[PDB]
Scaffold this active site. Structure first.
Site, PDB file in Angstrom:
ATOM      1  N   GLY A   1       0.995  -1.253   0.121  1.00 31.25           N
ATOM      2  CA  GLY A   1      -0.173   0.073   0.125  1.00 31.25           C
ATOM      3  C   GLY A   1       0.987   1.254  -0.039  1.00 31.25           C
TER       4      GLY A   1
ATOM      5  CB  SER B   1       5.418   3.199  -2.022  1.00 31.13           C
ATOM      6  OG  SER B   1       5.103   4.461  -2.651  1.00 31.13           O
TER       7      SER B   1
ATOM      8  CG  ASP C   1      -1.353  10.283  12.222  1.00 31.82           C
ATOM      9  OD1 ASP C   1      -2.648  10.708  12.522  1.00 31.82           O
ATOM     10  OD2 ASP C   1      -0.772   9.917  11.262  1.00 31.82           O
TER      11      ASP C   1
HETATM   12  C1  LIG Z   1       1.352  -4.783   6.848  1.00 35.46           C
HETATM   13  S1  LIG Z   1       3.023  -4.913   7.160  1.00 35.46           S
HETATM   14  C2  LIG Z   1       3.622  -3.265   7.560  1.00 35.46           C
HETATM   15  C3  LIG Z   1       4.623  -3.159   8.508  1.00 35.46           C
HETATM   16  C4  LIG Z   1       5.112  -2.103   8.750  1.00 35.46           C
HETATM   17  C5  LIG Z   1       4.706  -0.786   8.395  1.00 35.46           C
HETATM   18  C6  LIG Z   1       3.922  -0.916   7.272  1.00 35.46           C
HETATM   19  C7  LIG Z   1       3.172  -2.124   6.827  1.00 35.46           C
HETATM   20  N1  LIG Z   1       2.909   0.380   6.908  1.00 35.46           N
HETATM   21  C8  LIG Z   1       1.494   0.160   6.946  1.00 35.46           C
HETATM   22  C9  LIG Z   1       0.790   0.238   5.335  1.00 35.46           C
HETATM   23  C10 LIG Z   1      -0.576   0.924   5.322  1.00 35.46           C
HETATM   24  C11 LIG Z   1      -1.214  -0.087   4.319  1.00 35.46           C
HETATM   25  C12 LIG Z   1      -2.467   0.590   3.621  1.00 35.46           C
HETATM   26  C13 LIG Z   1      -3.394   1.099   4.770  1.00 35.46           C
HETATM   27  C14 LIG Z   1      -2.673   1.780   5.775  1.00 35.46           C
HETATM   28  N2  LIG Z   1      -1.494   1.345   6.440  1.00 35.46           N
HETATM   29  C15 LIG Z   1      -0.656   2.568   7.124  1.00 35.46           C
HETATM   30  C16 LIG Z   1       3.477   1.566   6.879  1.00 35.46           C
HETATM   31  C17 LIG Z   1       2.551   2.674   6.922  1.00 35.46           C
HETATM   32  C18 LIG Z   1       3.039   4.120   7.106  1.00 35.46           C
HETATM   33  C19 LIG Z   1       4.196   4.211   7.943  1.00 35.46           C
HETATM   34  C20 LIG Z   1       5.021   3.082   8.166  1.00 35.46           C
HETATM   35  C21 LIG Z   1       4.555   1.839   7.979  1.00 35.46           C
HETATM   36  S2  LIG Z   1       5.606   0.441   8.543  1.00 35.46           S
END
Ligand SMILES: CSc1ccc2c(c1)N(CC[C@H]1CCCCN1C)c1ccccc1S2
EC number: 2.7.11.1
Length: 273
Positions: free
Chosen positions: A13, A19, A135
């Protein structure tokens, strides 16, 4: 050194945080997450111990990543011509709290107690390391579905903790405290408590309390689901309009509704497996 050392996989995502791709460390086959962030879009920079200019997010991550915590750890990072790249833990299997609530709806109090506690420990740890997340919300909280452990992500909005007043905020509006809406100023802890106040309501009612500024500034909480006289108290106390009338973490963690918290493993047995 990057492209050799880790094995990129699917995308997971993107948004105002970059990204993220799935990935494996070759050296151990640890699952990791690879988060590309473009330089041209980074608003907020800092400097590490050795005095190198990096994005704040990285500073903050390094400060909170020492030893275990309810915080997804920075295992490493890299600089490229126009991006920065961050390797993070990847718990498996996992799900963010937004999807969880969007699926299962409002949470039983026992479950919300366990989760909320873990967020509190996690935020106490950040504050302890001199970091303010800034946040806190459902989609910035991951659940390791097997161990029942919550972990804290993105730090992209996020600052060094400080006792004087904050006048920027690149976070989530509906989670922002009335003091910010009205005056464009706030203090970290008090503001964080507010966001937690919103977080707890979301958990128990399955949706956030306030949509528009007028609703926030008015500070009046209506419960759409059946919630305990006692949980309502804690939520309202957390969402007090005057920052000084909000609880501290200690006070939140000594609140009656927070007693006899299930540990993470037993939480998963009863509520996740
Ligand atoms: C799943 S595994 C995983 C492990 C560590 C992180 C991330 C994903 N994502 C989340 C992804 C996103 C996917 C779409 C729905 C909303 N969310 C936030 C991330 C995002 C933002 C800052 C740091 C990180 S570190």
């Amino acid at each position: 050194p990057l492209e050799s050392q880790y094995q990129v996989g699917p995308l997971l995502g993107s948004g105002g945080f970059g990204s993220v791709y799935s990935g494996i460390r070759v050296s151990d086959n640890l699952p990791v997450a690879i988060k590309h962030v473009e330089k041209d879009r980074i608003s907020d920079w800092g400097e590490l111990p050795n005095g190198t200019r990096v994005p704040m997010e990285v500073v903050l991550l390094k400060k909170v990543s020492s030893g275990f915590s309810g915080v997804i750890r920075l295992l490493d990072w890299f600089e490229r011509p126009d991006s920065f790249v961050l390797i993070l833990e990847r718990p498996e299997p996992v799900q963010d709290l937004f999807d969880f609530i969007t699926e299962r709806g409002a949470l039983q109090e026992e479950l919300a107690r366990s989760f909320f506690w873990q967020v509190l420990e996690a935020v106490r740890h950040c504050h302890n390391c001199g970091v303010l997340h800034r946040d806190i919300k459902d989609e910035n909280i991951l659940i390791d579905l097997n161990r029942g452990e919550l972990k804290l992500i993105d730090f992209g909005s996020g600052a060094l903790l400080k006792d004087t007043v904050y006048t920027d905020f690149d976070g989530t509006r509906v989670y922002s405290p009335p003091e910010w809406i009205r005056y464009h100023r706030y203090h970290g802890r008090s503001a964080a408590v507010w966001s937690l106040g919103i977080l707890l309501y979301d958990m128990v009612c399955g949706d956030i309390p306030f949509e528009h500024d007028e609703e926030i500034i008015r500070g009046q909480v209506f419960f759409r689901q059946r919630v305990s006289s006692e949980c309502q108290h804690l939520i309202r106390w957390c969402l007090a309009l005057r920052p000084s009338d909000r609880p501290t973490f200690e006070e939140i963690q000594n609140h009656p509704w927070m007693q006899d918290v299930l540990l993470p493993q037993e939480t998963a047995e009863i509520h996740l497996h």
